[PDB]
Amino acid sequence: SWDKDVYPEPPRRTPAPSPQTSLPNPITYLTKAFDLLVDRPVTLVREFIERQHAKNKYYYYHREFRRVPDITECHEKDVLCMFEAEMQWKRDYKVDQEIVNIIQERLKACQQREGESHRQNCAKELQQFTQVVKAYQDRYHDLGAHYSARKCLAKQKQRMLAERKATKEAA
């Protein structure tokens, strides 16, 4: 399973079977055959394997990283602190990449499930995707293949000086 808040789905509304003709469709027979022949032995084997899982219940944990100081409060050419800052920033970089991938999955799943009216019915996912791509592009784009926290901080200082000059010239 997963979490239905980070991976949202609108509630499924299937219509009732309302047959108009008198000819029986093959799909009811095929669903009954797929339930008897296929679904029940798969369910029996899954119940067997699940009962074998319950005989030995052990666990794996999610790795927690406590927050070390970032690159802004590392002294210049102090490798014992800026190493920790660089590794922290690379882990945050992987996390931000996977956040953008999750929002891509939301956008693609909305474009599939809303059918033909997805241009109207997926403006929320499109706006979320636009926001997260704008934030990811302001944060990590144009760094290069030798990306570092020094490069990203220098890009942030360049962008903040551009924003401050645009604010002062509009004063």
Partner 1 sequence: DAPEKNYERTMAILQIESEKAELRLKELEVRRLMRAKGDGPWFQYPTIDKALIDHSPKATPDN
Tokens of 168: 């002062």
Q: Which is nearer to partner 1, 89 or 129 (CB)?
A: 89
Q: Which is nearer to partner 1, 74 or 132 (CB)?
A: 74
- Residues 6 or more apart in contact with residue 68 via CB below 8 angstroms: 84, 85, 88
Shortest distance, CB of residue 35 to partner 1, whole angstroms? 47
- Residues 6 or more apart in contact with residue 156 via CB below 8 angstroms: 139
Q: Which of residues 32-61 bind partner 1 (CB under 8 A)?
A: none
Q: Which is nearer to partner 1, 64 or 116 (CB)?
A: 64
Among 32, 83, 154, 158, binds partner 1 (CB under 8 A): 83
Burial class (CB in 10 A: 0-12, 13-18, 19+), 96: middle
CA-CA-CA-CA torsion for 108, 113, 119, 120, nearest 10 degrees?
-130
90 binds partner 1, rule: CB under 8 A:
no
Tell me the number of residues near partner 1 by CB under 8 A: 6
Q: Which of residues 61-80 bind partner 1 (CB under 8 A)?
A: 77, 79-80
* Nearest-angstrom CA–CA distance, 122 and 128: 10
SS3 20: coil
Q: Which is nearer to partner 1, 13 or 77 (CB)?
A: 77
* Nearest-angstrom CA–CA distance, 96 and 55: 38
Shortest distance, CB of residue 79 to partner 1, whole angstroms? 5
Q: Which is nearer to partner 1, 86 or 114 (CB)?
A: 86
**Which residues of this protein are in contact with partner 1, per CB under 8 A?**
77, 79-80, 83-84, 87
